[PDB]
Amino acid sequence: MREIVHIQAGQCGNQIGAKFWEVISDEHGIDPTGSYHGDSDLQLERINVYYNEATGNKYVPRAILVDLEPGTMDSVRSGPFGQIFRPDNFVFGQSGAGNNWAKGHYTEGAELVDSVLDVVRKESESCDCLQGFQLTHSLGGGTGSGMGTLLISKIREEYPDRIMNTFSVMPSPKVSDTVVEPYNATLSVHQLVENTDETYSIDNEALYDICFRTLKLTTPTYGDLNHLVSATMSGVTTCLRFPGQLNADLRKLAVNMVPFPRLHFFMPGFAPLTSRGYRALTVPELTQQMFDSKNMMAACDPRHGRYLTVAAVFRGRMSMKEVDEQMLNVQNKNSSYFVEWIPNNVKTAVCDIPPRGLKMSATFIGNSTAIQELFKRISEQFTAMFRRKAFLHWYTGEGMDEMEFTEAESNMNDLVSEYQQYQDATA
Amino acid sequence: KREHEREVIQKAIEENNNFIKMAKEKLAQKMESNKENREAHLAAMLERLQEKDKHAEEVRKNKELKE
Ligand SMILES: CC[C@H](C)[C@H](NC(=O)[C@@]1(C)CCCN1C)C(=O)N(C)[C@H](C[C@@H](OC(C)=O)c1nc(C(=O)N[C@@H](Cc2ccc(N)cc2)C[C@H](C)C(=O)O)cs1)C(C)C
Numbered sequence A: 001m002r003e004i005v006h007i008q009a010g011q012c013g014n015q016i017g018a019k020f021w022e023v024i025s026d027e028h029g030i031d032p033t034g035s036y037h038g039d040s041d042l043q044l045e046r047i048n049v050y051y052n053e054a055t056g057n058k059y060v061p062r063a064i065l066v067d068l069e070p071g072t073m074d075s076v077r078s079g080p081f082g083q084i085f086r087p088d089n090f091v092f093g094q095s096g097a098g099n100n101w102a103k104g105h106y107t108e109g110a111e112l113v114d115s116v117l118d119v120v121r122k123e124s125e126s127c128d129c130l131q132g133f134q135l136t137h138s139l140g141g142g143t144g145s146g147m148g149t150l151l152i153s154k155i156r157e158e159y160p161d162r163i164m165n166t167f168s169v170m171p172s173p174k175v176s177d178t179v180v181e182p183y184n185a186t187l188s189v190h191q192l193v194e195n196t197d198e199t200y201s202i203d204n205e206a207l208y209d210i211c212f213r214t215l216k217l218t219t220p221t222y223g224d225l226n227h228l229v230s231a232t233m234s235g236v237t238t239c240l241r242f243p244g245q246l247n248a249d250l251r252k253l254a255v256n257m258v259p260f261p262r263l264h265f266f267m268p269g270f271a272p273l274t275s276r277g278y279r280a281l282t283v284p285e286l287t288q289q290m291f292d293s294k295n296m297m298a299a300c301d302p303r304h305g306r307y308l309t310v311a312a313v314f315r316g317r318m319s320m321k322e323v324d325e326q327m328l329n330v331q332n333k334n335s336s337y338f339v340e341w342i343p344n345n346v347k348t349a350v351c352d353i354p355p356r357g358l359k360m361s362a363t364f365i366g367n368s369t370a371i372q373e374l375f376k377r378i379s380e381q382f383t384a385m386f387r388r389k390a391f392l393h394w395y396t397g398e399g400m401d402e403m404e405f406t407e408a409e410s411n412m413n414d415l416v417s418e419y420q421q422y423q424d425a426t427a
Numbered sequence B: 001k002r003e004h005e006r007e008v009i010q011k012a013i014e015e016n017n018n019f020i021k022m023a024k025e026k027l028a029q030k031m032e033s034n035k036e037n038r039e040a041h042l043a044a045m046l047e048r049l050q051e052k053d054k055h056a057e058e059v060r061k062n063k064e065l066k067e
């Protein structure tokens, strides 16, 4: 445990993956060239978790950029920070995955996958002690969906002893109009259940509704949604990047958050919710907000379920007494929403460095049984098409069988049944 | 898993090949049934006409039979 290898696949993966490096680069005082220009040495104490230090004391992100089309990666290379990334670490195709999981996993992705793994291997070599892997991707497309999950499976074969963690973007009919998305998403969940240690369920429905109802953006863009995603990614990784006691590594996080191996889908939360365009928040406000439904990055009502485990990260200069007071107040005021059979399931961290333009923030990470709502949604949409076998030719024309679909459908339905099991479980 | 991945791409290839094959076969079959049919139609037409010529000789011979 020390170094994290980051992989970003497909359009969504590369867009959110790019925004991630831009945000934490500024946080750790690294300019678009890779040169350090910060005020604190707290910025470099754990820099090697995400960055490789190179000759002439220049910091290179330990990032692999994957896609089955050049498009997005070209705009990432043309972008502000595209210069920070190692150019040998840009692995792309020309075909595209055409929003088809079968193309990303079996046909087109199959052709590119070993070139990615050679870059994964090279990065893994330059590691004194590799922790595991981080992947950004959407579950609704073809590349990040199909290729991303095949890359996880292949990485797991070569590194079975390491931690596999993902930032998976869930589809919403409010953001996308690609009919096949529920199919790709169910095929991807089946993979995530088996092969990941931790998954941050980033839901496009919740990101859209936050932008519309709370940020009062009439016509939200992808960059608006990605702004909330980059804030969430910066917050959920804090403990890994800065000196600290709680969840300072991927494994310690998993042991605190995962009571049952399939139940590793986290509902991230964030306070204050902001749009890209003064008024500081009190420790009590940060606490009410981070636990509020309106601040969740997954379109689930936490009050409809029970928390199995919670991680709370507070960023900035505040009272550790008051943080502790408010955290205990939240648990003691709503004790029914926290399983009694997992004693002291809420663990809190406080980090002195806040994000850009915020005096203070709070990031929540919850393993709530209410995540079954997101899975019931994708399941409702999948079953509606699959019971009439609609749009399957796109998949069977790639060599897949109805069996894979029936299996994926079953595993996700079983996962929803498991989350219910522990919601109705008493001590 | 690596086995099933291999099996799936192989099934994609065989179904595509079987498709090009069946198409090639259907066309060869149709262009031969049509060639034989059109030829048989012209043949039938010209025998009917050749028998009209045969009959005309029978008429010219029946005329010369009186002289
Ligand atoms: C006329 C159709 C519009 C474009 C589309 N409408 C729909 O999909 C609707 C609402 C119509 C029918 C039902 N359906 C769900 C739409 O609003 N969306 C698909 C948006 C996304 C769309 O919004 C607009 C207003 O353009 C896009 N946003 C960007 C964008 O943010 N571009 C940024 C760069 C980028 C490009 C692609 C990716 N994947 C990520 C980022 C650049 C801009 C300046 C920024 O930073 O916001 C591009 S298209 C999502 C969030 C609901």
Ligand SMILES: Nc1nc2c(ncn2[C@@H]2O[C@H](COP(=O)(O)OP(=O)(O)O)[C@@H](O)[C@H]2O)c(=O)[nH]1
Binding pocket: A009, A010, A011, A012, A013, A015, A016, A097, A098, A099, A100, A137, A138, A139, A140, A141, A142, A143, A144, A145, A169, A170, A171, A172, A175, A176, A181, A204, A207, A222, A223, A225, A226, A229
């Ligand atoms: N939040 C967010 N969603 C995105 C973005 N790009 C694509 N998506 C979503 O991802 C899905 C399509 O997957 P995409 O990443 O474009 O395809 P891929 O390139 O084949 O992996 C749909 O649900 C889109 O709404 C992005 O930048 N941000």
Ligand SMILES: [Ca+2]
Binding pocket: A111
């Ligand atoms: Ca090809």
Ligand SMILES: [Mg+2]
Binding pocket: A011, A141
């Ligand atoms: Mg695309």
Ligand SMILES: [Mg+2]
Binding pocket: A291, A292, A293, A294, A302, A303
């Ligand atoms: Mg609430």
